[PDB]
Amino acid sequence: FNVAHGLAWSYYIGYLRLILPELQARIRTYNQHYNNLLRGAVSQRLYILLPLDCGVPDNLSMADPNIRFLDKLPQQTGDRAGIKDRVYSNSIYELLENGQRAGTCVLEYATPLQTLFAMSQYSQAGFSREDRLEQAKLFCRTLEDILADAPESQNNCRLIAYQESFSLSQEVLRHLRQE
Amino acid sequence: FNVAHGLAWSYYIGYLRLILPELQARIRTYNQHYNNLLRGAVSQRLYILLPLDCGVPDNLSMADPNIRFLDKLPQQTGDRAGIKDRVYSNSIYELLENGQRAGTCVLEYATPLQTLFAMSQYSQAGFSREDRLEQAKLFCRTLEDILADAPESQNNCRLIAYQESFSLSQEVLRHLRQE
Ligand SMILES: Nc1ncnc2c1ncn2[C@@H]1O[C@@H]2COP(=O)(O)O[C@H]3[C@H](O)[C@H](n4cnc5c(N)ncnc54)O[C@@H]3COP(=O)(O)O[C@H]2[C@@H]1O
């Protein structure tokens, strides 16, 4: 173990609560400079990928070649715990359908899941691969419950959970099109 | 709960393992440009403050006015979990003795402790203030044990634990002078 409870709460307090209040204005700033009638605007919410037992690569294109990096948002800075101008950066991605762009949005993995699965490599961590699917689901359970009691944050992000045919770019496009 | 075990392991895997291998070269880069015989060079290790039951402000000067921000190190970047060029920044601080600079080093709090104590504010987190001193000590216990089995990381950082007369700038200067 039940290590997920701590990681889910850290993820919310130490990150989501910090960027989500300012995300909509950064997306607005980007769209105002780059949006025109020949293209779709960047979506308005943060899309968080939650692979429950898959890999968590750093390059999204290597999980699905139809997801490709497009641009960065404007940086967000803030002093935290003695670090001056700590940087919070996010990336914009395009979603391809039949070789053509069909969507764009701010996209990223839930990093603590990556940290959680990497405890694989250390015996003193007491985390075996047999527990990842269970702790990963609990992480999603805890985080789902937290944003239920925090509407202002729930409406600025969307969770996308999945396991291992199925296309990750299509799953993303499904959520974008229900908005 | 025993939430510290997860937070300590996340802190090591998701941060210390990432910056400590490259810290010595960034400090070298800074000293080479700004060091001269009229001043002391920036120390070579990362000094991590671990307040076990005190406050964790973002501005170190407000914990002790003899600790003042000096400069930033060169940024470190790296793609992580879909975020392109994720930024890892650190700050340099000067330590004052009788109104004169007596030391300089890279200094910061162990951020997860700040995240841990902020779970104060949420009932669904199940963390009461009566447990902070216990979980904080466990966090230090777990992290101390991890760097015992990781020498290469132990020699690039120094842990500084303390509770609530006593000067935080003097405690820091003590460690710098034993090096
Ligand atoms: N700028 C950012 N961009 C995207 N996501 C962010 C983020 N800052 C925090 N998060 C996410 O929130 C989790 C918990 O953050 P904490 O600050 O409480 O606890 C963090 C703590 O801040 C430290 N850490 C991580 N990145 C750091 C950085 N760039 N500078 C200083 N400390 C860092 O390591 C702990 C565990 O890291 P994780 O396993 O990655 O788990 C992180 C995860 O990276």
Swiss-Prot record, chains A, B:
Phenotype upon changing residue 112 to A: Strong decrease in c-di-GMP-binding
UniProt note on tissues of expression: Ubiquitously expressed. Expressed in skin endothelial cells, alveolar type 2 pneumocytes, bronchial epithelium and alveolar macrophages.
GO biological process: activation of innate immune response; antiviral innate immune response; autophagosome assembly; cellular response to exogenous dsRNA; cellular response to interferon-beta; cGAS/STING signaling pathway; cytoplasmic pattern recognition receptor signaling pathway; defense response to virus
Modification after translation: Phosphorylation by TBK1 leads to activation and production of IFN-beta. The phosphorylated pLxIS motif constitutes an IRF3-binding motif, leading to recruitment of the transcription factor IRF3 to induce type-I interferons and other cytokines. The phosphorylated pLxIS motif facilitates SENP2 recruitment during late phase of viral infection. Phosphorylated on tyrosine residues upon MHC-II aggregation. Ubiquitinated.
CC annotations in GO: autophagosome; autophagosome membrane; ciliary basal body; cilium; cytoplasmic vesicle membrane; cytosol; endoplasmic reticulum membrane; endoplasmic reticulum-Golgi intermediate compartment membrane
Residues binding 2',3'-cGAMP: 10, 15, 86, 111
Misc remark: The cGAS-STING signaling pathway drives sterile inflammation leading to type I interferon immunopathology in severe COVID-19 disease caused by SARS-CoV-2 virus infection. Tissue damages in the lung and skin lesions are caused by activation of the cGAS-STING signaling leading to aberrant inflammation. Endothelial cell damage is also caused by activation of the cGAS-STING pathway: SARS-CoV-2 infection triggers mitochondrial DNA release into the cytosol.
Quaternary structure note: Homotetramer; in presence of cyclic nucleotide (c-di-GMP or cGAMP), forms tetramers and higher-order oligomers through side-by-side packing. Interacts (when phosphorylated) with IRF3; following activation and phosphorylation on the pLxIS motif by TBK1, recruits IRF3. Interacts with RIGI, MAVS and SSR2. Interacts with RNF5 and TRIM56. Interacts with TBK1; when homodimer, leading to subsequent production of IFN-beta. (Microbial infection) Interacts with human papillomavirus (HPV) protein E7.
Name of this protein: Stimulator of interferon genes protein
Taxonomic lineage: Eukaryota, Metazoa, Chordata, Craniata, Vertebrata
Residues of the full protein shown: 153 to 336 of 379
